[PDB]
Amino acid sequence: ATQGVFTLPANTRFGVTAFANSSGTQTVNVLVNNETAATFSGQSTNNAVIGTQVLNSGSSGKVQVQVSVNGRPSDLVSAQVILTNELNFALVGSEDGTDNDYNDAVVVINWPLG
Amino acid sequence: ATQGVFTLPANTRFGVTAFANSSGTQTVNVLVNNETAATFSGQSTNNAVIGTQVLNSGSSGKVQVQVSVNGRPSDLVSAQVILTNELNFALVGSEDGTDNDYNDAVVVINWPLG
Amino acid sequence: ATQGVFTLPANTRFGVTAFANSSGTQTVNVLVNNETAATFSGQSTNNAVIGTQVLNSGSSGKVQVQVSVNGRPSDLVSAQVILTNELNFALVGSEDGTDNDYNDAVVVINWPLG
Amino acid sequence: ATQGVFTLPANTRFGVTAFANSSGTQTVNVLVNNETAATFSGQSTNNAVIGTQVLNSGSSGKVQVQVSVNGRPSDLVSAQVILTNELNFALVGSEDGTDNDYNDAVVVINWPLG
Ligand SMILES: C[C@@H]1O[C@H](NC(=O)c2cccc(-c3ccccc3)c2)[C@@H](O)[C@H](O)[C@@H]1O
Ligand SMILES: C[C@@H]1O[C@H](NC(=O)c2cccc(-c3ccccc3)c2)[C@@H](O)[C@H](O)[C@@H]1O
Ligand SMILES: C[C@@H]1O[C@H](NC(=O)c2cccc(-c3ccccc3)c2)[C@@H](O)[C@H](O)[C@@H]1O
Ligand SMILES: C[C@@H]1O[C@H](NC(=O)c2cccc(-c3ccccc3)c2)[C@@H](O)[C@H](O)[C@@H]1O
Ligand SMILES: [Ca+2]
Ligand SMILES: [Ca+2]
Ligand SMILES: [Ca+2]
Ligand SMILES: [Ca+2]
Ligand SMILES: [Ca+2]
Ligand SMILES: [Ca+2]
Ligand SMILES: [Ca+2]
Ligand SMILES: [Ca+2]
């Protein structure tokens, strides 16, 4: 199944935050309406926050997370959870290797803000 | 129901990251085995990361998040999600006022690391 | 925080299914747009499926679950999860006693159907 | 990533319940410690319950859901959600065709029971 794609409400601010847990340098690209809107890179085995930014979901509300290591796409896992019918989290994990820890880049999207 | 309490595997590193979305300064306490292990304080209406840390779940695995604003406890909402039976997210929202956005402090716990 | 309230897409068929795990007789009310649309009842400590129904979310999309036992309202916990940005589950647990298992009536809402 | 595999607490009763939403007859196999423990088959386009059963997670706690239609494996999506650190849902959707609704068989695993 497709993973790392989320439909947000249109024209809505959201937070995106990426963490790294791998010997491989992570590249996190965050696409809004199929164009890169934020990019984070880094290498950590201790959950560094390799980036955090506020973006706008724009007219389509389509948000996609892509994770690659030196140009090789990582395998993604994802889901969205809603608390008290108001508070939204879009969650991504990624695997750059063979151990299937799926934490090599971890991306958290949250909305609403403010 | 109790919210903001999570059972992690024992003796396991985890990440905790807090975001703020309120006119009020948020104070987040992260407890391990009922004792505060991290405190983050900050003020943002734009989802700023007010703190991030790596902690160890220790012998009990018990992790609790508490949020206060102007010396008063916020109401919490929480859940845990597991992706591909490997990647864990413990999610907390908090409400310090009357609008029930539950984003006033947002806390994300993730494990495993490395 | 409020629990057991979900916003579905308007005019959308959904499934609602109730499970019982308590010595107390469960009564589960399912409200659509603040009017009772389904009532299920039973008594099981082995997860009996006391009801399952297909309902339509109608113009408002508002669905609320309430649970009572021997005339007393149960405490609710809830969340919504979305898989592959398409498959939706709205989840409720309820507690009628002292043990905080929150399984006394369990309600799962799923959409889309067909 | 692997989907439909869940680690339950050992020696714990759990519920498994399947729904169908497809022109294809669904076959749901539930494996405990890699051995078939339950099988449900049925056909519905209206979310009918095609099976429900109570199983024991046994010494390993390993539970796996597989779905096939006319002997062809469906693609799966899954996650686990925990409410109030007590109430567990292991959720599976499956796709037997081209529309990516992932509801063709829906499988809900819930624990604890009782
Ligand atoms: C420390 C481990 O790092 C692994 N990752 C790698 O070993 C890795 C992956 C891709 C590329 C590279 C690499 C390539 C060129 C130079 C340096 C590192 C390493 C990762 O999958 C494991 O879960 C674990 O966190
Ligand atoms: C900007 C708004 O800020 C609210 N914040 C408050 O209601 C709040 C609650 C307690 C104290 C304060 C505060 C503290 C010092 C100075 C000014 C305000 C704000 C918050 O709940 C809303 O969701 C929104 O983000
Ligand atoms: C078997 C247990 O049942 C409990 N519930 C009760 O014991 C209960 C709740 C409400 C009413 C009654 C009841 C009252 C009068 C006479 C008989 C039963 C029991 C429940 O909370 C526990 O999790 C557990 O499943
Ligand atoms: C009604 C539709 O049914 C589709 N499924 C099929 O049409 C399907 C898939 C596999 C096999 C068969 C089939 C094959 C032989 C005989 C009868 C059914 C149908 C399903 O994917 C769609 O979401 C939708 O619910
Ligand atoms: Ca890895
Ligand atoms: Ca890793
Ligand atoms: Ca608020
Ligand atoms: Ca706020
Ligand atoms: Ca109970
Ligand atoms: Ca019970
Ligand atoms: Ca389908
Ligand atoms: Ca279908």
DSSP secondary structure, chain A, as one string: ---SEEEPPTT-EEEEEEEE-SSSPEEEEEEETTEEEEEEEE--SS-EEEEEEEEE-TTT-EEEEEEEETTEEPEEEEEEEEETTTEEEEEEEEE-SSS---BSEEEEEEE---
* Inter-chain CB pairs, A–B, below 8 Å: 113
Amino acid letter at A43? Answer: Q
Method for structure elucidation: X-ray
Q: What 8-state DSSP symbol labels residue D74?
A: P
Indicate the residue of A3, A7, A85 with minimum beta-carbon distance to C6: A85
* CATH code, domain with B102: 2.60.120.400
CA–CA separation, A25 and D108 (whole Å):
38
- Per the CB < 8 A criterion, the answer to whether D21 and D44 are in contact is yes
Distance, CA of D27 to CA of D54 (rounded, Å): 18
Give buried/exposed letters for A7-30 (b at 16+ CB in 10 A, else e). Answer: ebeeebbbbbbbbbbbebebbbbb
Residue B19: count of CB within 10 angstroms of its CB:
29
Name, in order, each residue with C-beta under 8 angstroms of C9's C-beta and a sequence gap of 6 or more.
C57, C61, C111
The shares of helix, strand and coil residues in chain C, as percent rounded to the nearest 5, are 0, 60, 40
- Going by C-alpha positions, the residue among B36, B34, B35, B30 that lies closest to residue B14 is B30
Q: Does D15 sit in the ligand 4 pocket, CB within 6 Å?
A: no
Beta bridge partners of C64: C5, C31
Question: What whole-number distance in Å separates Cα of residue C79 and Cα of residue C93?
Answer: 9
User: Given CA atoms D93, B76, B65, B92 in this order, what sign does their dihedral have?
Assistant: positive
C-beta neighbour count of C24 within 10 angstroms: 17
Q: Give the Cα separation of C45 and D62 in Å (integer).
A: 23
Distance CA A102, CA A93 (A): 5
Distance between CA atoms of residues D41 and D19, nearest Å: 10
Measuring from each residue's beta carbon to the nearest atom of ligand 3, which residues come in under 6 Å?
C 21-24, 45, 69-70, 96-97, 99, 101, 104; D 114
Instruction: Classify each residue of B70-85 as buried b or exposed e, where b means 16 or more C-beta atoms within 10 Å of its C-beta.
Output: eeeebbbbbbbbbbbb
Q: Find residue A106's DSSP bridge partners.
A: A19, A93
Interchain CB distance below 8 Å, C79 and A81: yes
Identity of the amino acid at C112: P
Q: List Cβ<8 Å contacts ≥24 apart for A31-35.
A: A31/A62, A31/A63, A31/A64, A31/A65, A31/A66, A32/A56, A32/A57, A32/A58, A32/A60, A32/A62, A32/A63, A33/A58, A33/A59, A33/A60, A33/A62, A34/A62, A34/A64
Sequence-distant (≥ 6) Cβ neighbours of residue D102 within 8 angstroms: A1, C83, C84, C86, C87, D75, D77, D93, D94, D95
CB-CB contact of B80 with B111 (8 Å) = no
Sole residue written with tokens 């007590």: D86
Tokens at B10, concatenated: 């024992």
Sign of torsion over alpha carbons B97, C34, A82, C2: positive
Residues with Cβ within 8 Å of residue B87, at least 6 apart in sequence:
A77, A93, A101, A102, A103, A106, B110
- In chain A, which residues are last before a break of more than 2.5 Å from C to the next N? none
Structural domains of chain A, count: 1
Burial of C58 per CB tally in 10 Å (0-12, 13-18, 19+): middle
Identify the sign of the CA torsion C31, C35, C40, C43. positive
| Best mutation site among A19, A22, A26 for ligand 1 pocket (most ligand atoms within 8 Å of CB) | A22
Tell me whether the omega of the peptide bond preceding residue A112 falls within 30 degrees of 0, making it cis: yes
Question: Is residue B11 within 8 Å of residue B58, measured between CB atoms?
Answer: yes
| B87, B92, B100: best to mutate for the A interface, most A CBs within 10 A | B87
Contacts 24+ apart (CB under 8 A), D69-77: D69/D22, D69/D24, D69/D25, D69/D26, D69/D27, D69/D96, D69/D104, D70/D24, D70/D25, D72/D96, D74/D26, D74/D104, D74/D105, D75/A1, D75/D102, D76/A1, D76/D3, D76/D4, D77/A1, D77/C83, D77/C84, D77/C87, D77/D3, D77/D102
Q: Which domain holds residue D18?
A: 1-114
Question: Rounded CA gap, D100 and D96, in Å?
Answer: 8
Q: Confirm or reject contact between B102 and chain A (CB < 8 A).
A: yes
How many whole angstroms separate alpha carbon C101 and alpha carbon D98?
40
On the 0-12 / 13-18 / 19+ scale of CB atoms within 10 A, A89 is buried
Q: How many angstroms separate the Cα of C88 from the Cα of each of A56, C76, C109, C110, D28?
A: 24, 19, 8, 6, 20
Task: Kindly report the backbone phi and psi dihedral angles of residue B51, in degrees, each rounded to the nearest multiple of 5, phi listed first.
Answer: -175, 160
Distance C33 CA to ligand 11 centre (A): 29
Which neighbouring-strand residues pair with B106?
Answer: B19
Q: Which of D71, D57, D69 is closest to D94 using CA atoms?
A: D69
- Tokens representing residue C58 in the block: 């109608």
- For C81, which residue in chain B has the nearest alpha carbon? B81
Distances (CA, A) of D110 to A20, B84, C22, C108, D52: 32, 17, 14, 10, 11
Report the distance separating Cα A112 and Cα B4, nearest Å: 19
Q: Judge whether D26 and D104 are in contact, CB under 8 Å.
A: yes
Resolution of the PDB structure in angstroms: 1.5
Cα end-to-end distance, chain A, whole Å: 33
Which residues in B lie closer than 8 A to residue A19 (C-beta atoms)? 15, 17, 110
Judging contacts by C-beta atoms under 8 Å, the chain A residues touching residue C7 are: 85
CA quadruple A47, B3, C19, C34: dihedral positive or negative? Answer: negative
Cis bond before residue C112 (omega within 30° of 0): yes
- Cβ separation A114–B45 shorter than 8 A: yes
By the 10 Å C-beta count (0-12 exposed, 13-18 middle, 19+ buried), B56 is classed as: middle
Strands B87-95 and B5-7, sheet pairing: unpaired
Q: Answer whether D59's CB lies under 8 Å from D33's CB.
A: yes
Separation between Cα atoms, residue A96 and residue B114, nearest integer Å: 13
CB-hemisphere CA count at 13 Å for A69?
Answer: 18
